[PDB]
Design a protein around this nucleic acid. Structure first.
Ligand SMILES: Nc1ccn([C@H]2C[C@H](O)[C@@H](COP(=O)(O)OP(=O)(O)OP(=O)(O)O)O2)c(=O)n1
Ligand SMILES: [Ca+2]
Ligand SMILES: [Ca+2]
Ligand SMILES: [Ca+2]
Ligand SMILES: [Ca+2]
Ligand SMILES: [Ca+2]
Length: 903
DNA sequence: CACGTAAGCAGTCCGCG
DNA sequence: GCGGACTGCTTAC
C-alpha cells in the first residue's frame, strides 16, 4: 500500500513520527528535520520560489529547527518578513507525503476507555489523584476487544470477581444486560492490588499504543487522573510511559473564564468524544453526561443504580463493572451512528495535519492552502499581528409580525463560499479598488457599474477574472465533496418517506429487508417490492435509511462548516490570510444579493399576477427569502384543488418552472453588473408551507427577526408523508427552555398552524390544568453557569447577580459541609427552579448540575417549595403570549357579549 | 494556541411626586 | 409596575 502518517510531533531538533509503512505495519522514527524558510531577494536573483504576489524569494535551508526559529527572531529584529511554513511538523508532513493521502482505518489503532474511581470525600480531582483507580475498560479497535481491569482489593472495600454470566442476564432477572453482541469480546482481568493493575495497564498500553485516543471526558478526567495517579505511585518517568516518545506537558487551555490543566501526551492524538460531539453534531444539549447523550442519540434507557456512585463498588461491584463496560460501548455506539471519528480522519488526512487539529478551521485551512501553494513552488507569507476590529455581516429584513398562510422559501447554495468563488476573492487576486456608492444604489441598479475589467464586490474591492485564487480553488474542492454527501443524505431522506408511506399498509408476511443502497433514490422496482413488505421488514429498512441519512448529514454539514469557516477565518486576526477587505467583500456582496433578488422577485411576481407594488417577499436573513404565496393560490382559486398535495404540487411546479428561472435571470444580471468571474448564485426552493386544505390552521407566523414557524409539506424536494414544523428561534428550539415546556409549546404551535385557534385553546386549557403534575426535571430551566466566583459574596449574591448564578449560590449554601453532594462546575450547565416566598433556602431560586437528580437531602424541599405559578408564567405563558399576539389569535377565549347566554 | 456577525429574550438596576 | 440601559445567554445565519 501507500504509506501514511499516524502522528507527528516536534521535540527539539527532532521530528517524531508514528506511521504505517508499505507493508501496512506500524512504525516509528526520529528525524533530524532540515526545514526551509524564505526571504525576499532582488529580481536579479534567479530562483524557482515566488511569494503569492509573484515577488521572488530565496530559500534558506537550516541545519536544524532551532536555527530556523532563531532566524525568524533575527528577521523580526531587523524588520523584514520571514516567509514559509513556521510550524515545522506541517512542512515535515508536506515533504514526507507529497501526494493525496489514502489511509486504511483498519491499520489505525483507536482506543476508547473510561475509568472508575471510588471517592468518599467529594469529586476525585485528577490533579490530586488521591484515590485508587478501581476499574478501567479499554476498547481496542484493532483487536475489537474490551480489556477490563478490575481492582478486587481497595482501602474502600474488598470485592469478589465480576461475573460475565450475570452481566449478560436481563436486568429483570438480576443481571446487568451487558449487550449480547459484545459479551464474547470482553477480556476480564482481576487484580488483588492497584499497583499490579496499573503496571499491567502500562505494559498493555505499550503493546497496544493508542493512535487515536477517545472516550467521554477522557481529556479532562480519565487521562489526567491516570497520568497523575501513576505519577504518585511510581514516579513521573513511569507516568511518561503513556507517551510513545516518553514526553508529556502539563498543559493550560485558555478559555474565557478560567483554565483547565490537561496533559499533552506526545505521539498520541486525543479526540475527546465530548469535544467531537459539541463540534460536529449541531445540537445544543441541556446536559452532556453520557447517560443523557446516549438516550438522546440511541433511545437507550438510563443505567439505573440504587444509592450513590461512591458506594456502588462496595454495594454492587457486579453492576459497577458492567456499567463501566457499557459506558465504553455506548461511545462506540454513538460513533457507529454519527461517524465523527471517520470525519476527523477524513479531514485530518485531507489537510495533512495532526488529527487533533480538525478542531481548528484555522490550522486546517493554513495546512490546505500551504500544501496547495507549495505544489506550485510558491511561498506563503509570514503570520502577522492584527488588532481586533469589528466588521459588518449579513442583512436581516424586519418582518411584519403576523400570520402567513402560504409561504415558499428560497436560499443560496453554500452562500459565502459561492460568493468567494463568484467574485474570485483570495489574498493574491486583489486587483484594486473603485469608489463605492451607497449599497442601496447597487441594490437598485442605479449606481455606476464598478468596473468593466475586474470582478467586484459592492464593498469597493476589485479582483482578477483571468486567474484563480488559492482560496477559491481550495474552497471549491471541499464544496464539491460537501455536495456529494448532501446528495447522499437527501436521497436517503427521500427514501425514508417512501418507507414511511408504505408503513400505512404493511403486509402480513414474513420476509426480509431489501438489500439496497439508501444513498440513491429507490428504483420503481424497489418501490414495488416495498409495497409488498411486512411491518417488521419496513421498520428495519426505515432504521437503515435514517442511519444512512445521519451519516450523510455528518459528512456534508461539517464540510459545509469547514468551507464557511474559511470565509470567517478571513476575519480572524490569527489567520495567515486575515484581511478585512476580503472578509467584507463577502458579507457586503451577501447583503446586496439578498436585497437585489428581493426586488427582482417582487417585480416578477407582481408581473405574473397582473399587479403592481404588492410586497411578496415577507422576510429574509443573510441569503434567504420567504415569499407569501397567498396571491399565487388566490389567483387560481383554492376551490380548484383536490387535496393538500394538489396545491403543494402546484406550488412546487410554480417555484421550479417559473420562479427559479426568473431568480436565475435576476442573478445573472447582478453578476454582469459586478463583472464577476463566474455566476454561482444558485437560489433553490427550500420549503413549501401552508395549512392542511380545508382546515382552520394558520399555516405559519413570524414574531420578529430570526423568530418564526411554518407548517412544511416539502423541504428541498423531500415530500413528507406527514407535515413537519420548521420552527426557528422560538422557545421550542432553545436548550434553556424546560423539556416539557418545549414539547407543550410545540403542540401549541402545531395546533395553531394545522388546526386553528379553538384547537389551541383546548390544548392550553388542558396543559394549564395538569402541568403541576409534571416531573420537576422536565419543568426546570437550563443555563450555563459561567463566572460563578465573581458574584459570590460570602456564599451570597453580589451586585448584578444573574438569576441562574443566584440559584447556584442557594444550592452551595444548602449543601454546605456535606461532602456527598455534587458540586456545580464552572462553565457547565445547571437546571434552575424558582422558589415560593418564605422557603428554607432563603432565596427566590435554586440551581443544580443538569442531567442529574438533585441530591436527596434537598430534593424533598425543592419539590415542596417549587413555584409552579412563576414557572408556568415565565416559560410557557409569556412565550405563548408572543406567538399568539403575532399571529393575531388568543390562547384563551376572550370575554364577549355572548358570555351573557347559557352554554 | 485562537472561523465570522446579527439579533432576540430574561434578568438586574434604577428612575419615578 | 414598566421603560430603558445594561449584562448574560442563546440562536439564525
Ligand atoms: N454556522 C454558520 C451558518 C451560516 N453562516 C454563514 C455562511 C453561510 O454561507 C451563510 C448562509 O447560511 P446557510 O445556513 O444557508 O449555509 P449555506 O448557504 O453555506 O449552506 P446551504 O447550501 O445548506 O444553504 O451564512 C456561517 O458563517 N456559519
Ligand atoms: Ca463512571
Ligand atoms: Ca444557504
Ligand atoms: Ca403493503
Ligand atoms: Ca439559509
Ligand atoms: Ca438548498
Amino acid at each position: 500500500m501507500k504509506e501514511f502518517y499516524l502522528t507527528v510531533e516536534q521535540i527539539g531538533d527532532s521530528i517524531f513520527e508514528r506511521y504505517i509503512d508499505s507493508n501496512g505495519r506500524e512504525r516509528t522514527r526520529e528525524v533530524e528535520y532540515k526545514p526551509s524558510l524564505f526571504a525576499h531577494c532582488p529580481e536579479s536573483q534567479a530562483t524557482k520560489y515566488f511569494d503569492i504576489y509573484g515577488k521572488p524569494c530565496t530559500r534558506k535551508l537550516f541545519a536544524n529547527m532551532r536555527d530556523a526559529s532563531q532566524w525568524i527572531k533575527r528577521m523580526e529584529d531587523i524588520g523584514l518578513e520571514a516567509l514559509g511554513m513556521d510550524d515545522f511538523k506541517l512542512a515535515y508532513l508536506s515533504d514526507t507525503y507529497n501526494y493525496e493521502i489514502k489511509y486504511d482505518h483498519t491499520k489505525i489503532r483507536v482506543a476508547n476507555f473510561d475509568i472508575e474511581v471510588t471517592s468518599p470525600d467529594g469529586f476525585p480531582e485528577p490533579s490530586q489523584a488521591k484515590h485508587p483507580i478501581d476499574a478501567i475498560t479499554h476498547y481496542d479497535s484493532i483487536d475489537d476487544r474490551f480489556y477490563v481491569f478490575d481492582l478486587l482489593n481497595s482501602p474502600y472495600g474488598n470485592v469478589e470477581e465480576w461475573s460475565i454470566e450475570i452481566a449478560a442476564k436481563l436486568q429483570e432477572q438480576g443481571g446487568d444486560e451487558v449487550p449480547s453482541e459484545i459479551i464474547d469480546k470482553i477480556i476480564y482481568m482481576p487484580f488483588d492490588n492497584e499497583k499490579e493493575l496499573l503496571m499491567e495497564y502500562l505494559n498493555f498500553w505499550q503493546q497496544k499504543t493508542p493512535v487515536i485516543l477517545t472516550g467521554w471526558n477522557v481529556e479532562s478526567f480519565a487521562i489526567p487522573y491516570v497520568y497523575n495517579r501513576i505519577k504518585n505511585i511510581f514516579g513521573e518517568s513511569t507516568a511518561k510511559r503513556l507517551s510513545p516518545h516518553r514526553k508529556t506537558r502539563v498543559k493550560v487551555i485558555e478559555n474565557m473564564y478560567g483554565s483547565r490543566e490537561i496533559i499533552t501526551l506526545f505521539g498520541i492524538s486525543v479526540l475527546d468524544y465530548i469535544d467531537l460531539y459539541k463540534k460536529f453534531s449541531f445540537t445544543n444539549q441541556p446536559s452532556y453526561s453520557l447517560d443523557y447523550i446516549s438516550e438522546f442519540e440511541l433511545n437507550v434507557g438510563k443505567l439505573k443504580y440504587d444509592g450513590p456512585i461512591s458506594k456502588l463498588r462496595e454495594s454492587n461491584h457486579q453492576r459497577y463493572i458492567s456499567y463501566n463496560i457499557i459506558a465504553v460501548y455506548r461511545v462506540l455506539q454513538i460513533d457507529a451512528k454519527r461517524q465523527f471519528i471517520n470525519l476527523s480522519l477524513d479531514m485530518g488526512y485531507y489537510a495533512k495535519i495532526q488529527i487533533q487539529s480538525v478542531f481548528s478551521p484555522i490550522k486546517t485551512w493554513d495546512a490546505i492552502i500551504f500544501n496547495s501553494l507549495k505544489e506550485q513552488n510558491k511561498v506563503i507569507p509570514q503570520g502577522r499581528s492584527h488588532p481586533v476590529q469589528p466588521y459588518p455581516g449579513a442583512f436581516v429584513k424586519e418582518p411584519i409580525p403576523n400570520r402567513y398562510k402560504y409561504v415558499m422559501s428560497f436560499d443560496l447554495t453554500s452562500a459565502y463560499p459561492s460568493i468567494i468563488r463568484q467574485v474570485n476573492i483570495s489574498p493574491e487576486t486583489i486587483a484594486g479598488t473603485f469608489k463605492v456608492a451607497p449599497l442601496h444604489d447597487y441594490i437598485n441598479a442605479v449606481a455606476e457599474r464598478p468596473s468593466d475589467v475586474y470582478s467586484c464586490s459592492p464593498n469597493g474591492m476589485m479582483y482578477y477574472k483571468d486567474r484563480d485564487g488559492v482560496v477559491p480553488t481550495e474552497i471549491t474542492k471541499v464544496f464539491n465533496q460537501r455536495k456529494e454527501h448532501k446528495g447522499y443524505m437527501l436521497a436517503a431522506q427521500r427514501n425514508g418517506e417512501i418507507i414511511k408511506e408504505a408503513l400505512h399498509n404493511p403486509n402480513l408476511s414474513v420476509d426480509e429487508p431489501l438489500d439496497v443502497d439508501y444513498r440513491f433514490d429507490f428504483s420503481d422496482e424497489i418501490k414495488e417490492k416495498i409495497k409488498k413488505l411486512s411491518a417488521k421488514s419496513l421498520n428495519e429498512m426505515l432504521f437503515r435509511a435514517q442511519r444512512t441519512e445521519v451519516a450523510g448529514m455528518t459528512a456534508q454539514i461539517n464540510r459545509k462548516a469547514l468551507i464557511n469557516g474559511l470565509a470567517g477565518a478571513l476575519g480572524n486576526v490569527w489567520f495567515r490570510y486575515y484581511d478585512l477587505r476580503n472578509a467584507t467583500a463577502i458579507t457586503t456582496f451577501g447583503q446586496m444579493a439578498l436585497q437585489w433578488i428581493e426586488r427582482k422577485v417582487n417585480e416578477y411576481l407582481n408581473e405574473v399576477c397582473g399587479t403592481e407594488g404588492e410586497a411578496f417577499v415577507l422576510y429574509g436573513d443573510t441569503d434567504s427569502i420567504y415569499v407569501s404565496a397567498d396571491k399565487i393560490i388566490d389567483k387560481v382559486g383554492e376551490s380548484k384543488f383536490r387535496d393538500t398535495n394538489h396545491w403543494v404540487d402546484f406550488l412546487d411546479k410554480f417555484a421550479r418552472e417559473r420562479m427559479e428561472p426568473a431568480i436565475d435571470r435576476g442573478f445573472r444580471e447582478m453578476c454582469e453588473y459586478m463583472n464577476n468571474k463566474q455566476h454561482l448564485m444558485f437560489m433553490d426552493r427550500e420549503a413549501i408551507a401552508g395549512p392542511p386544505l380545508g382546515s382552520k390552521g394558520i399555516g405559519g407566523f413570524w414574531t420578529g427577526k430570526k423568530r418564526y414557524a411554518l407548517n412544511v409539506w416539502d423541504m428541498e424536494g423531500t415530500r413528507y408523508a406527514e407535515p413537519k414544523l420548521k420552527i426557528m428561534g422560538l422557545e421550542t428550539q432553545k436548550s434553556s427552555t424546560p423539556k416539557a415546556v418545549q414539547k407543550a409549546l410545540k403542540e401549541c404551535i402545531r395546533r395553531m398552524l394545522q388546526e386553528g385557534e379553538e384547537s389551541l385553546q383546548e390544548y392550553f386549557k388542558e396543559f394549564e390544568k395538569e402541568f403541576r403534575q409534571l416531573n420537576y426535571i422536565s419543568i426546570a430551566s437550563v443555563s450555563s453557569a459561567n463566572n460563578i466566583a465573581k458574584y459570590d459574596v460570602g456564599g451570597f449574591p453580589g451586585p448584578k447577580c444573574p438569576f441562574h448564578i443566584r440559584g447556584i449560590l442557594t444550592y452551595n449554601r444548602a449543601i454546605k459541609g456535606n461532602i456527598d453532594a455534587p458540586q456545580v462546575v464552572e462553565g457547565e450547565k445547571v437546571y434552575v427552579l424558582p422558589l415560593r416566598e418564605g422557603n428554607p433556602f432563603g432565596d427566590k431560586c435554586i440551581a443544580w448540575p443538569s442531567g442529574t437528580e438533585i441530591t436527596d437531602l434537598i430534593k424533598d424541599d425543592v419539590l415542596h417549595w417549587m413555584d409552579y405559578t412563576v414557572l408556568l408564567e415565565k416559560t410557557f405563558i409569556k412565550p405563548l403570549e408572543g406567538f399568539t399576539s403575532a399571529a393575531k389569535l388568543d390562547y384563551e377565549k376572550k370575554a364577549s357579549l355572548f358570555d351573557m347566554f347559557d352554554f
